[PDB]
Design a protein around this ligand. Structure first.
Ligand SMILES: NC(=O)c1ccc[n+]([C@@H]2O[C@H](COP(=O)([O-])OP(=O)(O)OC[C@H]3O[C@@H](n4cnc5c(N)ncnc54)[C@H](O)[C@@H]3O)[C@@H](O)[C@H]2O)c1
Ligand SMILES: NC(=O)c1ccc[n+]([C@@H]2O[C@H](COP(=O)([O-])OP(=O)(O)OC[C@H]3O[C@@H](n4cnc5c(N)ncnc54)[C@H](O)[C@@H]3O)[C@@H](O)[C@H]2O)c1
Ligand SMILES: NC(=O)c1ccc[n+]([C@@H]2O[C@H](COP(=O)([O-])OP(=O)(O)OC[C@H]3O[C@@H](n4cnc5c(N)ncnc54)[C@H](O)[C@@H]3O)[C@@H](O)[C@H]2O)c1
Ligand SMILES: NC(=O)c1ccc[n+]([C@@H]2O[C@H](COP(=O)([O-])OP(=O)(O)OC[C@H]3O[C@@H](n4cnc5c(N)ncnc54)[C@H](O)[C@@H]3O)[C@@H](O)[C@H]2O)c1
Ligand SMILES: [Mn+2]
Ligand SMILES: [Mn+2]
Ligand SMILES: [Mn+2]
Ligand SMILES: [Mn+2]
Lengths: 384, 384, 384, 384
C-alpha cells in the first residue's frame, strides 16, 4: 500500500508581532486558565512576564511553570503535571524552544490519558487528544510547534524517548521572529543546523512525499543563505525572519516525511550526556550523509546545488560529494565543535549508543539500512 | 504589518484507498448523522452508496444529498440546508469535486451562523465555525478539501461569490487517487489547468510567502510533466497520483497566498454563462499573465523554467514571454476553447463582468492594480 | 582646462517618515517664517497641511502658497515673490514635484537678487546665495530638490528658460517615499522615465565624470527593475523606495554632467504646449539616442546591459541597438503616448521648436552635434 | 527605521589647477583671516606660501599653522587652537592629507563648540557647526575634504579617537591632482589602499544604501586599474587624476555608509605605535574581510569581479575568497608589510587594542558582530 498523510495545526501565525494574538486566540478557545510552560533562561529574561501580561488582558489566567529543561525530562513532566492540576489549569501555552514545546505537549497529553509519559513512547500509542495548547516558538530550528513529536528524556535509561503521536499536534502555533532576535550566536547556529538537518533528512527519507519534498527544498535554500547572516548578526532582522520561515518549512517536512540516523544517533548522545540537540545534529550530519550517499546519490547531488555549490561538468557522484564538503564548511564557519570527544563522550559508551540508536523510530525512514558495526563506525568518526 | 498566517485542516489523508477511513474518522468526532453532499453524476455512478456503507458500518448514519450542481448555486445551498435540518444532521461529508466541497461548506457555514449564504461574501464575515465537515476529493484541481474558500453562485446577480473564511476550513480531508481514475479527459484537463492557475496566481500574488512559494513551484513542475499524461490516458496511475499531489500543493499555495484577476474574472464568466471553472481560467490565464508581466517579470521568467522552457541567453523579459507561450501551448494541447465567444459570451455583458470582477476578493492580491478600463480590455481579448 | 565640480545640498534626508524632520530642521536653520511653495493638487489633497503643522509644531510659522503651476511660470514666480514679502517670510519650503521646487528656487533667488527671474537665464549669472530653502520631493523624477537648475517658463517666447546658478542649490533636501505613494500610475511612469532620461543623458554627456558615471549607472539599473513595479502597483513600498533612490542618483548625475538634446527639445515642447515634462522626454528619448548613437556606441551598448538586455556575441553596434529597443519596449509597457501629434503638437511649429532647442543650455553637452535640419528630423520622427 | 541621509560639502572642485580658486571661494564666504593648517613637509615645499599668495591676492588674510603631524594629536589641536585665537582668525584652510584636514576640522569644531576635542568622540556629540573651512587635499586616499570624520589621537590612552559629526563637513573642498604628483611611491600606495579600504568597508557596511553602493563600486574598479600605475610612476598624470576621483568616490561612500573593524582596529595600532594609517588598513584588510565573509558573501563575491578576478563556474563563496587573494596580491605588489610585528607591535598590548577597537564608532556598521575574543584573534593574525 501507498498511503500517506499530512499533519499540522490548523492555524499557524507568522511575522513580527504575531505573539500579541496569543491572548485573544486563547480566549477564542473558551479556556479559563493556562499553564505557561517555559524554561528558566527565558523566565529570567522576563519573556514569561511579557507574554503572561498579554494573556491576562484577554481575560485568561496564567500560572507560570518555568521548569522545563534543555533536553526535557520525565520529571519535568511529572512536576509540571502536578502544577497543572494544583493550579486548576485547563490549557497550556508553551514559550521557548523545542524543550518547552515538548514539555508542554507531554503535560497536555498525560493530563488527558493519565499514566506516565513513558506509556506513550513509539507511534500513536495514545487515546485522547491533548488539552488545548498554543505553541509560541522562540528558536529557529525545531518546528516542534508544528509537529506530532514530543521528545522526553527517560532519566533512568539515559535515552531521549521519541513520542510520535497525532494527539500532540498543537491547536495553534505562533512564530514571531521578534522573540528570536535575542538568541546568542551559538544558539542561533545550532538551532539553525537542526533545521538544516530536518530538511536534509526529510529530503532523503524513505517516507518522503512531493509535498514534504517541496518544503524541504525551500528550507535548504533559505538556510544556506540566511543562517550564516543570522549567526554573524542576530540583529539582522531579515535573516531572523527568513530563518523563522526555514525552521517551519523544515518542521513541516520532517513531521510528515520522517528523519534518519542523524537524529537516531543524536538522540542517544543527548540522553547520555545532555548535549545540545542542535550541536549533536551538526556534528553528526556529514558522517551520516557520507554513509547514506550510495542510496540517494541523485538527491544529495541536488542538495549540493541547493547549498549553492556549482555542479557543472560533474558526475552525480562528484556533485553529491560537494554537498558534504559544503555542510562541513558551514559547520566549521559557524564554529560547531569538531567532534564529541572534546565535549565529553566516552569511548566505552559507543556500542550502547549505537545499539540504542537502532531502536529509535527516526531510524526507520533512513534511506540506508545499516548493521550495528556500521552505526558504530559513524559514532567513532564523530569523535575526532 | 508584515504578519501572515498559514491555514489547513489538521489531518489530510492521501493515497490509494484513503477513502476507507471516512467512517472511523467521522466516528472519532462524535457526530451521529452526516449529510452526504455530492452531485447527480457521482451519485448515478453509485459512488454515493459505497461511501455511505463505509460511514454506516462505523455507527454514523448517512442522509444523501446528491443535488450540488457544477458551479453550486445559492439555491443548491438553501435546499441543502433544509435537507440538513429535515434529516436531523449534525455533520457533513462532501464527495466529488469543488462543487460538492463548496456546496457542503456553504450548508455547513449557514447551519452554524444563520442568515443566508450571501451574507458571507467577502473576507472573514461569519462568527462561528462551520459544523463538522470531512471533504473527499474526486477531482484533481480545486484543493477545496483544504481551503478556507467556497464559491457560491448568486443567481439573481449572476456572480459566483467568493466566501473566504477561516471558518470553512474542513475538519479533515481525504484525497484518494483511486476515486480520480474515472475523470474523462476534458474534466481531467479543466481541473488540472485550474490547479496550474492556482499555482501560478499564488506564485505572483502580493500575498506570497516562502512557504506558499515552495508549494506553488512544486505544483507547476509536477503539472507540467504529468497533466498531459493524465489527459492522454486516464488509467496512467502514476500521472493520477502525481496530479493528486499537484492539486493539493496548489490548494495550499493559493489558500494562503491569494489568487488574482484570472479567478476574479473567471468567477464572472462562470456566474453569467455557467462555463466550467477551469476552462475559464485556461482562456484568461495568458491574458492576465501578459497584463501582470511588468509587475512580476522575474517570477514569470522562473515560471518558464518550471514549465520546462529553455531560457538560455535571454533577458528576464524574453524569458517571461516564453512562459505565456508555454501556457498557451499546453491549453491548445489539451483542447481548451481559444476564446469565450464560441462558448456563448456576449459583448454587451463585458462592462458588467468587469465591474463585478473588481469586487471579487481575489482581485485584492493580483500583483498589478488595474483601472476598470484595463479589466474591460482583458475580457475583450478573451472573447476571440 | 579639464576642471570640473560636483554640487549638491550639504544635507539630504531619505527614507520613510523623513519629512517629520522638516520642522526641527528648519528651526535649527534659525528662520522664523516659511512661505510653503506647493501646487494646487497637493494642496487639494491635504498634504500642505500635514507639512504645515509639522513646521508649526517646531515653533516656525508657515504661509501656504499653493499656486505653483505645472511648468512653473514667470507669473507664478512674481505672484509668489510678492506673497513672500507681503507676508513677511524669511525662508522657503517647497513641497511637490519639480514644479514646486523650481517655483521656490525662483522665488528665493529673486528674493535676494532684486530684479526678475528673467534676469538670470543662462549660467551662474546670479550674484548672491538664494534665501534658505528646504525642498520636499514627492515625485520620482526631476531631482530638483538636489540641483542647481530652475526651469521657469517664459510665457513670452513660450520657452522654458534655464537659470543654472550655484545659488539655487537648496539648503537641505528631503526625500520621503511615503509622500510618493499617492502618485497615480501615469505620473509615476512619466517622472520615472524623466529620471531614466536624466541618467542616460548624463551617461553620454560630454560633461561626464567617473563620479557622475557611478550615479547614472545605478539609476539606470534600479529604474529598469522597479519603475514597472511602481507603475503596476503604487502601493509597492519597495519599488517606491528604490525609485526615490533612482530619482536622486539621476539628479546627482545630470546636475553635474549635464543633459543633451532630449531635454533641449522637450523644453521647447513644454513651453509651447504645456505638455507634461516627463512625457516629452519619454517620447523623445529613443529618437535622440538613435541620433546620438555613432558618437557614443560603446556607452549605449553598456546601457543595453544595464537595462537587462543579453548582449553575448553581439557587436558593440548591435548591443547598442538593443538599448533602443529596450527603451521603446519600456515606453510601450507604461502607456506613453506614441508621438506628439496626438498630444496637440502643430506641424507649423517644428522649425521654431528646433531653432529654440539649439539655443538651450542642455544642447551644449549632447555628444553628437547636429545641424538645424537634423534637429528638425528628430522632431518629425516624434510626431507619429 | 529605513531612514538614511547623505552628507557632503555643497561645492567640490576637481581637476588640474582647481586650487587657483581658493581665494575667490574664501572671499565669497565673507571671511577675513584664515588659519592655514598644513604639515611640516608641505610647508618646506613652498605649498603653504603658494596657496597663501592666492588667498591674499583676493583680499583675505592668511596665518600659517604648519604643525599638523601624521596621526594628528590632541596637542596639535590644542596648539592650533591657541594659534587660531592668537591671530584671531574667523576661518580655516586645510592643505595636505588627512592629518591636515582633521587637524583643521578639530580646531574649527573646538573653536565653535567649547571645551576640548576629547569631548566629541563618538557620533553627533557637538552642538554647533564648526567655523568656515575649505579643505585642499594632496593625497589620494583620505576623502576627508568631503567627510564628517576627524580622527584625533588621545595621547594618554593611545587611541586615535573617531569623531563622527555632521558639524565638521567642510564648507568647500578642492581636489587638485597637480598637487598630488609629488607623492612618493610609498605614500601613494598607503593612501591608495586606505581608499580601497574605504570603498570595501562601505560596500559591506550595514549602513550601505543604493547611493553609497554606486560610489563604492566605482572606487574599487578605478583603484584596481590605476593605483598600481600611480605607484609605479607618480608622473603618470592619467593615473593621478583617476586616483583623485576614486579617493573622493570612496570618501563619499564610507562617509555615508560607514566603515567597519578594519578601521576600528587600525585606529588602535596607529594610536599605540603611530604607524601610517594606510599601512595599518592594508595589513588588517584581508583578515577582517575573511572574518566578515559569512555575513556578506554575495557582496564579497562582487568585489572579486570589481578587482578583475575571473569568477566563472564558482560558488559565491569561492568567488568571495578570490577577492581576498586579490586584495593580498595588490598589497604584496605595492610593498606593504606582511604583518605588524616587524613594524614593532607587541603581543602584550593586543588585549587593550581589541577592547578599544570595540569602543570605536567604526565598529557599529561592521556587518559581523564579534566577541572580544574574535577581535583578539584578528589582531594576532595581523601580527605575523
Ligand atoms: N518534537 C519535535 O518536533 C522536536 C524536534 C527537534 C528537537 N526537539 C527537541 O527540542 C529540544 C531542543 O530545543 P531548542 O534547540 O529549540 O532549544 P531549547 O528549548 O532546549 O532551549 C535552549 C536554551 O535556549 C534558550 N533560548 C530559547 N529561545 C531563546 C531566545 N529567543 N533568546 C534567548 N535564549 C533563548 C533557552 O532559554 C534555553 O536556555 C531538544 O530536547 C530536542 O530533542 C523536538
Ligand atoms: N473553494 C475552493 O477552494 C475552490 C477552488 C477552485 C474552484 N472551486 C469551485 O469548484 C467548482 C469546480 O469543481 P471541479 O472542477 O472539481 O468539478 P465539479 O465539482 O464542478 O464537478 C464537475 C463534474 O465532474 C464530475 N466528476 C467529478 N469527479 C469525478 C470523477 N472522479 N469521475 C468522474 N466524474 C467526476 C461530477 O459528477 C460533475 O458532473 C467550481 O464551482 C469552482 O468555482 C472552489
Ligand atoms: N533639476 C531641475 O531643476 C529640473 C529637472 C527636471 C525637470 N524640472 C521641471 O520640473 C517640472 C516637472 O515636475 P514633475 O514632473 O515632478 O511634476 P510637477 O511638479 O509638475 O507636478 C505634476 C502633478 O503631479 C501632482 N503630484 C506631485 N506629487 C504628487 C504625489 N506625491 N502624489 C500625487 N500627486 C502628486 C502635482 O499636484 C501636479 O498636479 C517641470 O517644470 C520640469 O521642467 C526641473
Ligand atoms: N575621513 C577622515 O577624517 C579620515 C579618513 C581616513 C584617514 N584619516 C586620517 O588621515 C591621516 C592620514 O592622512 P594621509 O594619509 O592623507 O597623510 P598625512 O596627512 O598624514 O601626510 C603624511 C605625510 O605625507 C606628506 N605629503 C602629503 N601630501 C604630499 C604630497 N602631495 N607630496 C609629498 N608629500 C606629501 C606630508 O607632508 C606628511 O609628511 C590619519 O591620521 C588618518 O587617521 C581621516
Ligand atoms: Mn531535530
Ligand atoms: Mn480555481
Ligand atoms: Mn528632466
Ligand atoms: Mn581611513
Amino acid at each position: 500500500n501507498t498511503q500517506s498523510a499530512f499533519f499540522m495545526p490548523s492555524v499557524n501565525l507568522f511575522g513580527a508581532g504575531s505573539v500579541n494574538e496569543v491572548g485573544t486566540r486563547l480566549a477564542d478557545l473558551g479556556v479559563k486558565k493556562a499553564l505557561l510552560v517555559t524554561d528558566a533562561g527565558l523566565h529570567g529574561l522576563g519573556l514569561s512576564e511579557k507574554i503572561s501580561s498579554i494573556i491576562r488582558a484577554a481575560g485568561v489566567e496564567v500560572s507560570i511553570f518555568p521548569k522545563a529543561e534543555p533536553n526535557p525530562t520525565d520529571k519535568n513532566v511529572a512536576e509540571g503535571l502536578e502544577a497543572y492540576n494544583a493550579e486548576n489549569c485547563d490549557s497550556i501555552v508553551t514559550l521557548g524552544g523545542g524543550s518547552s514545546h515538548d514539555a508542554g505537549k507531554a503535560i497536555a497529553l498525560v493530563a488527558a490519558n493519565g499514566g506516565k509519559i513513558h506509556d506513550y513512547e513509539g507511534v500513536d500509542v495514545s487515546k485522547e487528544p491533548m488539552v488545548p495548547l498554543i505553541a509560541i516558538n522562540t528558536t529557529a530550528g525545531t518546528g516542534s510547534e508544528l509537529t506530532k513529536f514530543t521528545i522526553i528524556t527517560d532519566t533512568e535509561r539515559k535515552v531521549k524517548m521519541a513520542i510520535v503521536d497525532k494527539h500532540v499536534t498543537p491547536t495553534l502555533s505562533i512564530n514571531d521572529p521578534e522573540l528570536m532576535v535575542g538568541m546568542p550566536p551559538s544558539l542561533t547556529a545550532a538551532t539553525g543546523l537542526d533545521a538544516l538537518t530536518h530538511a536534509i533528512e526529510a529530503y532523503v527519507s524513505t517516507g518522503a512525499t512531493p509535498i514534504t519534498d517541496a518544503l524541504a527544498i525551500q528550507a535548504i535554500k533559505i538556510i544556506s543563505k540566511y543562517l550564516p547572516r543570522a549567526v554573524a548578526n542576530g540583529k539582522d532582522i531579515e535573516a531572523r525572519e527568513q530563518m523563522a520561515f526555514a525552521q517551519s518549512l523544515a518542521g513541516m517536512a520532517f513531521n510528515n516525511a520522517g528523519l534518519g540516523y542523524v537524529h537516531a544517533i543524536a538522540h542517544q548522545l543527548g540522553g547520555f550526556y545532555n548535549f545540545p540537540h542542535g550541536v549533536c545534529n551538526a556534528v553528526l550530519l556529514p558522517y551520516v550523509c557520507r554513509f547514506n550517499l550510495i542510496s540517494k546519490v541523485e538527491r544529495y547531488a541536488e542538495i549540493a546545488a541547493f547549498l549553492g555549490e556549482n555542479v557543472d561538468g560533474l558526475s552525480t557522484y562528484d556533485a553529491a560529494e560537494k554537498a558534504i564538503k559544503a555542510i562541513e564548511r558551514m559547520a566549521k564557519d559557524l564554529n560547531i565543535p569538531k567532534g564529541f570527544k572534546e565535549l565529553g563522550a566516552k569511548e566505552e559508551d559507543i556500542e550502547t549508543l549505537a545499539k540504542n540508536a537502532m531502536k529509535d523510530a527516526c531510524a526507520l525512514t533512513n534511506p540506508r539500512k545499516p548493521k550495528l558495526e556500521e552505526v558504530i563506525q559513524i559514532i567513532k568518526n564523530a569523535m575526532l
